[PDB]
Every structure is written in structure tokens, then in C-alpha cells.
Amino acid sequence: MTVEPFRNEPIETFQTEEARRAMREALRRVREEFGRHYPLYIGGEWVDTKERMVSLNPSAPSEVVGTTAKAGKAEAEAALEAAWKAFKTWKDWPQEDRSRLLLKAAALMRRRKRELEATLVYEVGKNWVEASADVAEAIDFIEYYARAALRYRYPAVEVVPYPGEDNESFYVPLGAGVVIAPWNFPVAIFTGMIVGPVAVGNTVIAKPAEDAVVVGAKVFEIFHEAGFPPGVVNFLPGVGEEVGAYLVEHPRIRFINFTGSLEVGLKIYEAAGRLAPGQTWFKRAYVETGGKDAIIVDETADFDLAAEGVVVSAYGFQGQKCSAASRLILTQGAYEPVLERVLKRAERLSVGPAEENPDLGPVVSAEQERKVLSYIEIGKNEGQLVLGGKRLEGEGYFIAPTVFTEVPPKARIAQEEIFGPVLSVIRVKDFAEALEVANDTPYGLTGGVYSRKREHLEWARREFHVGNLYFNRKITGALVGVQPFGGFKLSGTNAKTGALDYLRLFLEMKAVAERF
């Protein structure tokens, strides 16, 4: 295989008339398609069920974007049999052949980009640029992992020679595993978690989040068209606590690739440590969980630059990002200048139906709305509400950009992942205290520093204990290949997506010696 060097898929900003025209048509066609039903995909065929999953439009929840079939235990078993049967032959494909299949899937995804973006807009309430970033990231995972997999090809291991012998060490895939995905990046993360393991010869049963089952099905339409052999990838929309747990706990599941809440991640990691009756291996579980991410600004920073980056990081996709700035830690000299600029910028943000390309669409569901509003009530008794803090008028789940200030570092709203448009501002004396506060949470995912002082930046490089750290720019939107993505502490197992190391997680090593 020889292809062009990897480059990231450009993120569309929709500033040209051509881009706006294409997006309007894609939005119109997706809207006109509301109510479509998508079956399961098992062993190379679409398989329907009696029960269904319903996906609502969070900007107008009386509108059904689509429905899917619903996987229970029988369908989970059928998918297991298909995946294990497929693994037996898929594992023996030359890596070049598997990588070409990924490249075909990326080309098909790229040709369906506007459609997939438009589906994100309606199904999970992304504005147009957030939708474009999500799809571009998905394409990047396929392109990146296709190339990275070749770096592991037979026989890839560097060993010490021995007289009179051939010593050959090589990687082999693990088997059939389950991928359990979140609603907040339901094209990007769903795709990445599936194609990485599959690229190197594993087979996958994929369980999309309930709120994002339609866009999950469209990704599977791409996989089917690309021509992955029957059983290699399987699509099981259903209830995580039911069919997801069933697969996690199953003796015949080899690995679990999970991205989602800390609460669920803890249950999955604990279950994966157990030997199910008849199980004949130690399960691998990769769990990438939440964050309570901070941006620190000190008195040497460009305050206008900082305020812009904070607003982007805090409120992009309504704060529903594992990478979102939910804490703003300001040294004494930075406090007033930065807070005033952040408030001025944030009060200008538009909120409305995602199709309108507002600054913020709705949060994803009634239950998410309930949780975010609950945390706002908690926050009112912990810090000082200085902006927003209300549901807005309308059927859609619209919440105003919200700011609390003078927040105690140990307050619930300064410790717990709210996953909505809610920023907690913490005032500290100096940079040392800023780092102490930044580090003092159970999490360790993303972080940022705005500062012109070299010594503060390099100190943070050494001591701001997060897996993805950014200086003088936004802390969201890690690019595949550029910024290996994954955290420390209770932000998960540090499985770095979009990095060469990711694929090693889905391989084991054999060493074979022949004495001549």
C-alpha cells in the first residue's frame, strides 16, 4: 500500500455560497427523510425486530428523526456468532487488504459528508460547524488507522537474534469485542472505536447511544457499501444497561471499547475484571470517561484571546464535550479583566434550533436538560450566578449559557461533570495556586493555559496533570494524528485515540523460534 501522507479532513465553516447551498440541500433532504426506520445490521444483513428505538429532534422533540430496531439478548447472541465466525477469516486478511477496505469506507464517508453533518444537526442538536468537525474527525480516524495499522504488519517486532535460529515475533488481533459509544460524538467516536480494532483484524459488535441511533445506522450503511465481510462489523442499537451490560459481562466477549460517563465506565471496568463462567481469557477494557476541564489564565495573558478561547471551549456544542472548559481559573490580576470579557462575549451567544446554525443548539434530551438544570440549582447555593442559569422558551431543550463566579474549588459544580453550558469561575492568588486547583479533581482529561510567561507555560507542561493540554488556544477539538487524545485519573484508561499506540491495544504478540 502506498497512499498520500495523512492529512486532516478540512472542517467546513460554511462561509462560501457553495458550502451554504450544499448544506441547505443536505438539511432539506434529511428533514424530508424524518421517520425513516433502520434495522440492526448483523452478519452482513439488515435485520429488523418487533421492538424499536425512537430518536427525537432535541430542537423540536415532537419530531421523530427516525427509529431503529432494538437489540436484546437473542440479537446480541446472533451478533456474537457472526462476529466470531467472521474473525476466523478476517484475522488472516493481509493488512494491506484490510487497510484498503478502510480507505474505501473513508472515501464513501467523504462523499456523504453533508448528509451526515445534517443528520447530526437534527439528531443531536449540533450547529453546522460542530457537525462538520464531528464528521471530519470520523473520516480522519478511518484514514489515520488505515495507515497506522500497516506499522504493525507481519512480522513487526524488533527482537535480538540468536545463533542457529530464526526468532520471529508478530502481532495478532484479539477476537470479537463490543464497542459502546456516546451520543455527543456519534459519528466520530462511534467510527473511531469501531475501525481501529477492525483495521488490525478484530471484529466488532457496536452499540450506539440511544439518542444517536439514526446517525449510527448511516455509518453502517457506509460500512455495508464499502464491503466489510459479513460479521466483521455489527450494529446493535439498544439499551446500554440491558444489551450493553449483557455483552460486557459475556464470557465470549474478548474486549470492550467504551467511551461515556465515569459512572458507566466504572461498572464496565469492574465487570471486565471478572471471569464470567466458562470465560477463557482476561478481558481487555478501554474506558474513556468524563472530564472536569479547566482553563487557567494569568495576568500576563492576551485577555481578549483568552476570553474568546474560553467561550469556544465552554459553550461549543452546548458544553456537551468531555473536553469542554467547565472551569475557568483566574489569578488575581486576571480575574476582573478576563471575567468581564468572558461575560460580554457569552451574553452575545445565540441559542435556537440547530438547523438555524445558532451559536448553541439545545442540549440532547429531556433527561440531560433535567440534569443540567438540577446542577444549576445546586450551583446557586455554592457560587454566585452572574449569567444565564435558565431554560429558555420553546419545545426544544434550550438552556442559556451560564456562568457562576467565586466558586469554591471543592463545590459540587467545581468537581462534578455537568455536561451542559455551565462555566464555574474560580479566583486564585497566583499561578501555583491555579495549578493546585486545576489538579484537584478526580479527572485529568483536557486543560489549557493562557499566559505569555514562558516559565508558567513550561511549568504547566510538567505539572498540569491532564492528558491533553493546550497553550493560548481552545481546549476542545483535538485533531486526529496531531493531538493523541485521552486522559489521566478518572478520565479513563489513557487509550490515546488518533495515535499509533491506539492499535496496539487491540493486538497480542506471539514469538516463534525455529532451531535449524
Place this chain on the structure above:
Amino acid sequence: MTVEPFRNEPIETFQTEEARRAMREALRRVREEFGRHYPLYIGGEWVDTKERMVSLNPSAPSEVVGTTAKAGKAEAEAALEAAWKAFKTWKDWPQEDRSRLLLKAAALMRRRKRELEATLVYEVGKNWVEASADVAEAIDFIEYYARAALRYRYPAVEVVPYPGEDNESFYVPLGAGVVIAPWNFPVAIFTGMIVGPVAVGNTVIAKPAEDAVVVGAKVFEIFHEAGFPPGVVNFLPGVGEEVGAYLVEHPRIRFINFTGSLEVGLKIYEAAGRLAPGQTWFKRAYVETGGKDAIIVDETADFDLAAEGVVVSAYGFQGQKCSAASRLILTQGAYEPVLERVLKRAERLSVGPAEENPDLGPVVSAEQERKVLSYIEIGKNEGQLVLGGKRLEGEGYFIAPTVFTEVPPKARIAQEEIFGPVLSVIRVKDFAEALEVANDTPYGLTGGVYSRKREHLEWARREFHVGNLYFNRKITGALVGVQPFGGFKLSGTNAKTGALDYLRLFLEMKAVAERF
């Protein structure tokens, strides 16, 4: 750091008069020191306790070879404090400085080779060459990991650049962890499991097996003389199910590096999956467990070569190896010729006090003797006893080389790890059936094939599902660097010792971007 390319430490054969003289001298020195008491080693100092552990000579169990202090929970806590305190600064050492420390420790160990070998002879009943192989492997781990660690040095990660930014990804060590070690390779595996994590900036609390506490203490004498900073390595002889479990379950233990039985490995892996109260990370646990390792011989093999390799593999160190051939799978054409040669060779093996350099010393303990004799009784009900199966005369735990034939593939003696000098012989139709029988255990550690048929060897390369596979040679004695060592299935987590990949297990990755 520029040192000579890695080479394996030569294993002494004692064919010269000088080597034999040097060994006799070392045996004399070691036994003159049987009265010695060895304290714990915590925070850079030897620390004694009220209670003690006693180590016996398995060739003469009324003879005490030494005593050590005994770590309980309070000592575990003191070691944890020391290890975390040391981690704060040890993690910041330049890799070159840490690697030099390892190389110093290797040089000190090499200078004490005969002393350590003699200690293995008396404490765990290794004959001379088994003892020399163990010490040489220990030296190899130190030399190999010192060099391999430099491959991870700041900033090691290959990333995709982005305009107007520096993007820098690099590895950092995890923290303080616990190493829990077996008695069968109590210099080699004890050393490897400690120095691998330590090389890249972790700190370690090491819990030697009860039967091998004296030689573990001597390894710590080397670490102390080498000058590891206080708290970087700590020595806690004690009861696995007490102080070992305490550390495994502790919220402040970052990782667990374990080699031992499947029974214990299962408990450790399960515990490691749980969030202990106040714990702030997902624990990493590496567990390398037992094997039920087979050698296949087909009718095309050199039967004399096969018989010699089978006897070495089955009976080296009394079969007390995770890699030992405990199953001999013979195709119909190979059955009589190979079995007759194996019996003729095995019946000529000497058994006696390890210091006399017999073919077999004693098994390690009264408990091991009881286990092995119990499996012999089970075997009598499952297969045909054709050689040995008896305790031999003397206080020492001497058991005769044992062979059962016509053993059903699903018999307990064909499935369960006996860890003694007991070989189960299984007759099969052809090579296909040989592979089916080879694969049909819960384990997947080592395996071998004797055959001249290229198609059978290459078939086995693809389908004999063990981590370490050997053609036309013994299946024990994996060399550091040459044969990455670790298994599949219930043989553990595939942490490949003596391989570049090993050190990655003890690192996490940070990605830091600066937008200029």
C-alpha cells in the same frame, strides 16, 4: 548514553575446573551465612520487624537457609509513603540517569553471580545450570530494560504537525505500584518485574514469594549498593494473601505487576478492576499466570532430538516452570518411537540434593510435594502410570520423573497445571488432531513442535495458539530480547517480558500543544 549493543549473559555450564571451583567456593560462603537475618528495605534503609519469616532448604528442610523480617499493613503503609515520596522526584530524572542506575545494578549483580546461583541452589533447589540460567536472565532484564527505556525518552511520540503550533506528545510514568513475585524464578522474574517499571520512572514495592525471601533480600543488597534513591525500590517479604492483597486492593496503589498462579492472578485482576474507596484512577494490573504446555511430535521428526528436548522441557527444575512441557502429544506414527526414547532418557535422570548438581533437585516445599503427589493419585485414575510416580527417600522433597500415558485430552492431569515432574502423554491420529488437542486447554503460554515437515511447522506458526512457540528445540528458557515472553488466554495478560513493548505498560501519554 552509549553502551555496547545488548547481548545475553552467557549461561555457565561448569565444564571448566575454574567454574566448578568458583561454584564450590560460593556454595561454601552461602551455607556459612545460613544464620543470617535480612530485614525489610523501606525508604533506602533496612528496617526490621518483631515477627519473622523462615526459609528452608528443600533438599534438607530441617536446615534453615535464612530468616527475614515480615511486613504487615503498617510496613505496607510505610513503603507506600516512601514510594510516593520518591516518585515525585524519581519521575523527573533524565532517562539516561535512570538507565545508568540500572546498568550499575547489572554490573553489581554480574560480580555476585556465583553467590546468587548458590543461594538459588540452597533456597529453592535449583541444580547448578538452572541456577546460572536464572541469574543470567536477571542480568539480562536489567541490561535490556536499561536500553529499551531510552526508546521512550522525552518526547518520543510521532505526531502529525499543524500550522502555527508546536504539538508535543511524550510518556510519563504512572506512580508507585506493587510487584508480587513467584518462587520459581526468584532472581530473574523478581528482578525483571521490579526494574522494568522503575527504569521509566515508576517506584515499586516488591513482595517476594515466601519460599524465596533470602535470595530476594540479596537482590535488594545489590539495589542498595547501586544507589537507587530512598523509596524507589522497597522490599516487603510477607504473606501474599495478607500484605500482598492489602496492596492490590489499596486505593493508592497505581499498578500491580504479578507473576504466579492462575488462582491468585484471577483474584488480583478482579480486585484491580474495582474502585477502592477514595481511589482516583483506573488501576493497571499485569498478571502472568500458569501454562499447560504441550510439545507435539509427528512421524517426520528427528525422534532422538525430540526425546532429548521433551525430557529437558518436562523435567528441568523438576517441571516447576510456567513454560514446562507437561503434555506430550504424539501422532500415531510418532507414538512408539518417541515414547520409548523419552522413557529411556527419563529413567536415567538423577534426583537428589540440588547442590550435587543432579538432573533434578527436590520440589520446593512440603506444600508443593503434597500438590504433586495428589496429582499423581488423580493421574492413576485417568491415565496409565509408566514411570516414576513416587516420593524418593530422604527428608528433602524428592519426587521421581513421572510419565502417564494414554491420557485423555480432557483429563484433569491433561488440563490442570501440576507444576511438578509429571508428563502426560496423549496419542492422536494426525497433525490436525495434535493441534486441536494442543489448543484445547484454558491456557496458552508455551508450546513446541518437533517435525521436519515445513507445512506442519508453518501451520503451527499460524494455529498453535500459544505466546511462545518453539520448533525442533526445548520450550523452556526463553531468552530476554530474543523471545518476548508471555501468553494468551488464562496464561495471563500478554505482558511480553524482555521486549520493547513491556515498558509501555508502565507509561501513560500526555499531548501538549502551543499555539504561537
